[PDB]
Design an enzyme around this catalytic site. Structure first.
Site, PDB file in Angstrom:
ATOM      1  N   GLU A   1       0.828  -1.226   0.000  1.00 30.84           N
ATOM      2  CA  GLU A   1       0.000   0.000   0.000  1.00 30.84           C
ATOM      3  C   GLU A   1       0.852   1.262   0.000  1.00 30.84           C
ATOM      4  O   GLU A   1       0.540   2.234  -0.736  1.00 30.84           O
ATOM      5  CB  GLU A   1      -0.914  -0.056   1.227  1.00 30.84           C
ATOM      6  CG  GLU A   1      -2.000  -1.090   1.111  1.00 30.84           C
ATOM      7  CD  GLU A   1      -3.043  -0.883   0.025  1.00 30.84           C
ATOM      8  OE1 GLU A   1      -3.007   0.160  -0.642  1.00 30.84           O
ATOM      9  OE2 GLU A   1      -3.899  -1.787  -0.186  1.00 30.84           O
TER      10      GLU A   1
ATOM     11  N   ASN B   1      -7.754   8.713  -5.766  1.00 29.65           N
ATOM     12  CA  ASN B   1      -8.554   7.750  -6.559  1.00 29.65           C
ATOM     13  C   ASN B   1      -9.310   8.500  -7.654  1.00 29.65           C
ATOM     14  O   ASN B   1      -9.537   9.699  -7.525  1.00 29.65           O
ATOM     15  CB  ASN B   1      -9.472   6.961  -5.645  1.00 29.65           C
ATOM     16  CG  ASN B   1      -8.743   6.304  -4.503  1.00 29.65           C
ATOM     17  OD1 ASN B   1      -7.740   5.638  -4.776  1.00 29.65           O
ATOM     18  ND2 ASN B   1      -9.189   6.479  -3.271  1.00 29.65           N
TER      19      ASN B   1
ATOM     20  N   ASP C   1     -12.286   8.526  -8.451  1.00 25.44           N
ATOM     21  CA  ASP C   1     -13.613   9.006  -8.004  1.00 25.44           C
ATOM     22  C   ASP C   1     -13.482  10.246  -7.119  1.00 25.44           C
ATOM     23  O   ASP C   1     -14.549  10.773  -6.706  1.00 25.44           O
ATOM     24  CB  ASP C   1     -14.349   7.903  -7.241  1.00 25.44           C
ATOM     25  CG  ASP C   1     -13.811   7.498  -5.865  1.00 25.44           C
ATOM     26  OD1 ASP C   1     -12.772   8.012  -5.422  1.00 25.44           O
ATOM     27  OD2 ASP C   1     -14.445   6.683  -5.212  1.00 25.44           O
TER      28      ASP C   1
ATOM     29  N   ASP D   1      -6.548   8.045  -0.591  1.00 25.69           N
ATOM     30  CA  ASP D   1      -6.061   7.010   0.342  1.00 25.69           C
ATOM     31  C   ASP D   1      -4.896   7.621   1.129  1.00 25.69           C
ATOM     32  O   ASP D   1      -3.985   8.262   0.531  1.00 25.69           O
ATOM     33  CB  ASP D   1      -5.573   5.793  -0.443  1.00 25.69           C
ATOM     34  CG  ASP D   1      -6.681   4.997  -1.096  1.00 25.69           C
ATOM     35  OD1 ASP D   1      -7.857   5.286  -0.844  1.00 25.69           O
ATOM     36  OD2 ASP D   1      -6.339   4.008  -1.807  1.00 25.69           O
TER      37      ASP D   1
ATOM     38  N   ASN E   1      -9.057   4.967   2.909  1.00 21.16           N
ATOM     39  CA  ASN E   1      -9.786   5.770   1.893  1.00 21.16           C
ATOM     40  C   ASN E   1     -10.751   6.770   2.540  1.00 21.16           C
ATOM     41  O   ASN E   1     -11.542   6.356   3.396  1.00 21.16           O
ATOM     42  CB  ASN E   1     -10.480   4.827   0.914  1.00 21.16           C
ATOM     43  CG  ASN E   1     -11.088   5.420  -0.331  1.00 21.16           C
ATOM     44  OD1 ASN E   1     -11.463   4.698  -1.263  1.00 21.16           O
ATOM     45  ND2 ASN E   1     -11.203   6.707  -0.420  1.00 21.16           N
TER      46      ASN E   1
ATOM     47  N   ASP F   1     -15.206  -5.105   9.134  1.00 24.77           N
ATOM     48  CA  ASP F   1     -16.377  -4.526   8.415  1.00 24.77           C
ATOM     49  C   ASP F   1     -17.116  -5.635   7.671  1.00 24.77           C
ATOM     50  O   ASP F   1     -18.291  -5.408   7.313  1.00 24.77           O
ATOM     51  CB  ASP F   1     -15.959  -3.426   7.437  1.00 24.77           C
ATOM     52  CG  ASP F   1     -17.107  -2.699   6.755  1.00 24.77           C
ATOM     53  OD1 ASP F   1     -17.992  -2.221   7.477  1.00 24.77           O
ATOM     54  OD2 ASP F   1     -17.098  -2.610   5.502  1.00 24.77           O
TER      55      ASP F   1
END
Ligand SMILES: [Cl-]
Ligand SMILES: [Cl-]
Ligand SMILES: [Cl-]
Ligand SMILES: [Cl-]
Ligand SMILES: [Cl-]
Ligand SMILES: [Cl-]
Ligand SMILES: [Cl-]
Ligand code: NA
Length: 129
Positions: free
Chosen positions: A35, A46, A48, A52, A59, A101
């Site tokens: 990462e 990103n 969109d 990050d 994110n 999650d």
């Protein structure tokens, strides 16, 4: 801060990530390697418009507030800048929520593509932990 491999393993163990949600420390070190290359200050935009942040590239779409990700959440209740600290506490605490999650470490696409199923113990090999 750019951690060394065993230095990061030790810090992650100090902050209770080793075997968290059943993921051995080598999983977490491998995820961090791909990462961020162990750099706490890593940031990546990103497509969109989310960003990050940090050693585990958390994110802004869900986990932290950076003020510039429309319609996003802040489920770790932290400014995304906190994820860039030399002290990994905020990144670890938030990573514990992400891995809880429901999809485990698959949330980290680099972990799924580069660490999952590999000899991740190599990442902690030789470390005094
Ligand atoms: Cl390395
Ligand atoms: Cl391991
Ligand atoms: Cl925002
Ligand atoms: Cl939120
Ligand atoms: Cl904030
Ligand atoms: Cl630390
Ligand atoms: Cl799992
Ligand atoms: Na956000």
């Amino acid at each position: 801060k750019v951690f060394g491999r065993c230095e990061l393993a030790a810090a992650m163990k100090r902050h209770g990530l080793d075997n968290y949600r059943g993921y051995s420390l080598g999983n977490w070190v491998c995820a961090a390697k791909f990462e961020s290359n162990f750099n706490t200050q890593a940031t990546n935009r990103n497509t969109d418009g989310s960003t990050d942040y940090g050693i585990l590239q958390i994110n802004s779409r869900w986990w932290c507030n950076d003020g510039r990700t429309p319609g996003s959440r802040n489920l770790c209740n932290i400014p995304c800048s906190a994820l860039l600290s030399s002290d990994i506490t905020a990144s670890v605490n938030c990573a514990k929520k992400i891995v809880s999650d429901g999809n485990g470490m698959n949330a980290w696409v680099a972990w799924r593509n580069r660490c999952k199923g590999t000899d991740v113990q190599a990442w902690i090999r030789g470390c005094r932990l």
